[PDB]
Amino acid sequence: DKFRLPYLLGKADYIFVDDFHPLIYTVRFRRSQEVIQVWNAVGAFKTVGFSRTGKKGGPFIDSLNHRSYTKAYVSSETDIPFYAEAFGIKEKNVVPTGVPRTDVLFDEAYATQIKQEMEDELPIIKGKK
Amino acid sequence: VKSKIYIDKIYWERVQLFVEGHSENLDLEDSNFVLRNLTETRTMKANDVKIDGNQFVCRFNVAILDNGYYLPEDKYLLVNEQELDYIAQLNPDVINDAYQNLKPEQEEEYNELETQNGKINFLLQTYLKEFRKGGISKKTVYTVTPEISSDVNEFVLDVVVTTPEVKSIYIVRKYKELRKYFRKQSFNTRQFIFKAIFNTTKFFHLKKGNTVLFTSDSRPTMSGNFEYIYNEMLRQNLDKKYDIHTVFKANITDRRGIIDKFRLPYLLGKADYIFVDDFHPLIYTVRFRRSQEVIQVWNAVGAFKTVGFSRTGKKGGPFIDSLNHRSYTKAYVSSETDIPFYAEAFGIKEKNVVPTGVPRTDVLFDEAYATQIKQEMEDELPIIKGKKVILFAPTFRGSGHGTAHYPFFKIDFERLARYCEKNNAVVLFKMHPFVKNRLNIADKHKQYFVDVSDFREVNDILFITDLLISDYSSLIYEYAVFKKPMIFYAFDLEDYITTRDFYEPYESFVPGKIVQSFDALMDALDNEDYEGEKVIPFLDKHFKYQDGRSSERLVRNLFG
Numbered sequence A: 001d002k003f004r005l006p007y008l009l010g011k012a013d014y015i016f017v018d019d020f021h022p023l024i025y026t027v028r029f030r031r032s033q034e035v036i037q038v039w040n041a042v043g044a045f046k047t048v049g050f051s052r053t054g055k056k057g058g059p060f061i062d063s064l065n066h067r068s069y070t071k072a073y074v075s076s077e078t079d080i081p082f083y084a085e086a087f088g089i090k091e092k093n094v095v096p097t098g099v100p101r102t103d104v105l106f107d108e109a110y111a112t113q114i115k116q117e118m119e120d121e122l123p124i125i126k127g128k129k
Numbered sequence B: 001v002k003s004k005i006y007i008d009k010i011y012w013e014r015v016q017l018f019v020e021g022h023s024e025n026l027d028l029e030d031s032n033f034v035l036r037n038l039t040e041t042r043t044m045k046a047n048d049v050k051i052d053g054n055q056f057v058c059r060f061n062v063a064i065l066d067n068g069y070y071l072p073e074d075k076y077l078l079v080n081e082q083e084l085d086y087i088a089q090l091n092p093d094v095i096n097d098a099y100q101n102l103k104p105e106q107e108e109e110y111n112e113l114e115t116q117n118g119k120i121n122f123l124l125q126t127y128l129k130e131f132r133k134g135g136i137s138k139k140t141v142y143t144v145t146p147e148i149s150s151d152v153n154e155f156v157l158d159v160v161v162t163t164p165e166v167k168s169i170y171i172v173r174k175y176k177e178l179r180k181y182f183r184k185q186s187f188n189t190r191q192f193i194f195k196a197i198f199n200t201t202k203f204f205h206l207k208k209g210n211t212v213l214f215t216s217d218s219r220p221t222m223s224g225n226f227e228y229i230y231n232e233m234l235r236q237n238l239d240k241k242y243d244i245h246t247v248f249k250a251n252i253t254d255r256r257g258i259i260d261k262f263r264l265p266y267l268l269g270k271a272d273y274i275f276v277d278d279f280h281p282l283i284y285t286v287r288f289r290r291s292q293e294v295i296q297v298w299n300a301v302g303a304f305k306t307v308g309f310s311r312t313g314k315k316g317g318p319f320i321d322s323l324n325h326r327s328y329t330k331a332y333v334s335s336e337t338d339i340p341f342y343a344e345a346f347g348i349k350e351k352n353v354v355p356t357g358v359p360r361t362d363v364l365f366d367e368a369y370a371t372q373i374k375q376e377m378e379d380e381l382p383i384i385k386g387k388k389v390i391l392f393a394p395t396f397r398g399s400g401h402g403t404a405h406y407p408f409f410k411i412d413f414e415r416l417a418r419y420c421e422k423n424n425a426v427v428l429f430k431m432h433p434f435v436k437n438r439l440n441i442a443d444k445h446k447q448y449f450v451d452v453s454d455f456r457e458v459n460d461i462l463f464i465t466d467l468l469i470s471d472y473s474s475l476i477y478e479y480a481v482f483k484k485p486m487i488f489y490a491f492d493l494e495d496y497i498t499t500r501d502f503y504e505p506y507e508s509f510v511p512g513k514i515v516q517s518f519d520a521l522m523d524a525l526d527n528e529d530y531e532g533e534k535v536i537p538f539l540d541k542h543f544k545y546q547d548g549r550s551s552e553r554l555v556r557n558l559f560g
Ligand SMILES: Nc1ccn([C@@H]2O[C@H](COP(=O)(O)OP(=O)(O)OC[C@@H](O)[C@@H](O)[C@@H](O)CO)[C@@H](O)[C@H]2O)c(=O)n1
Pocket: B298, B299, B300, B301, B302, B303, B304, B305, B306, B307, B392, B393, B394, B395, B396, B430, B431, B432, B433, B458, B459, B472, B473, B474, B475, B478
């Protein structure tokens, strides 16, 4: 994997990133390459990224800690400025399509199945609330 | 009433800077707010602009503005792009609001303010936002402070990016140190050999020769002041008695040819009459014998702005112990009143300063040359056939040639062009040769405005113009001979007076209206009142001789 990471980063057109990935921020990508950041957290609640500038543990304004993104995907349009400025990327890059992990909360069949599974594996949840 | 847009309040979110205000006589529906630098190289639209009637708020992001990066070290104006731009002037409410909320120690520090700009900056330091990594570090700072820039007299957002000195590997550091040492040794050896050859060359004569040397570090070939002195010498058979040598360099920072490198010191030692025209630093590092003469024929005409030792204690000036202008015996000025100022400037005795008239002004009092140059400028520039011709000609706003610059944005092209269209007049522009900016001209602008920064003859255009909008240059001296009015664009009078003042007070010295803002220009030209009644006294007083025989008197005085 040590050899695969730089070579694959160089040759891969589409790259998906889930969280802070420090290695990907030490290189410059071609314009043809699309680096995609799909944040694990659903929405913009707690100050992340460049919004911590001036606070402890926050990157400097000139750092490249989240710049190399082509697309970032967010839950709703009200997160476009917050997350766009958090990654230090353009607002056109950030798009409100919805988090891929939120696709699991609206399926009825999985809801019922997991309800039964949690009832079985936790006997205490037999109660009313 | 002119449409204006003001800044009412400056918020600051986490890293996001907000500007809110209102505008009058201006519909903001199609507004494009930007952050434009004084040098006009960086524009960046506000990320979000919310508009409610004449009220507005502009959401600026110092993290993603510069095409995705942060705002670099510069000074930015808030400009509403449109068919006509608008530089947002700060409301006086904002600077009033800070003024009433000073803690007593702030008040104690507040009294030592020289001018309005210092008051403005100190009051607006309460809108500062400093970003330090972790909030503690004092060595990496990204600070944005709204302020009215003294140099441009306009509201700006100074962004200072303090970064530590990043050093490379010890091999590269050793290489850099060795390179610096080698450069220092080379410079020392060159100075040693220059001093040696000059000293030896003068020591072998100890007598009165017949050689005349013209030198200038900033005038390729013989031209300017030297040309008239040389022509006057040749006219009265002074080339049949003396021998004339010329040593020239393209510019101050340029290097010299192989022959001239060692020919200049040899002639400096040998020459009895040595001629200079401006700062010639290779001459102020040597000592001359008494029988020699170093004639300083300054390019400019009169003592308008400070120069030499007269700016000691000010930035860019020499300390009182320097020899930077002292090796002269006959410095020639155009008026009696220039003797004390110019003797102070050069650091020479006042008897060394003679009021004969600068030879460059030989042509201004001529008549055949007037018709000749009028025909030449009419043919080569047919656009000057308008009813009146106006000439903008400001001086450099920088500290010197190395820092040459000009914030042109102070001039709005469209309003002047509309005035020209209404008045069937033409305005011509000639920035100083010590400039680095290039003019940009638009469609209707080309039909009136003319970019003139290439014409070799400095006084070429003054023969045709019926006005002159200049602020601080000595061009008003040459133009004064034509009995014409001029307007003065004292845009940054306070800052310029602070940096380098004038040998006389500015407000009364200038022969014309004083003017601070562009609206004052349209007031003066639209009303067609210029106070030309005082340009005739200026020409009478600051020009000792009106006979136009300056070169003749200079050569007669020097040689007999
Ligand atoms: N648009 C322009 C304006 C001016 N010019 C020519 O440039 C010369 C000097 O002009 P300027 O004074 O601005 O330059 P400096 O600051 O170096 O002069 C220092 C000081 O000695 C001098 O001002 C004196 O008046 C005070 O003692 C003059 O010949 C002008 O014709 C030009 O070609 N085009």
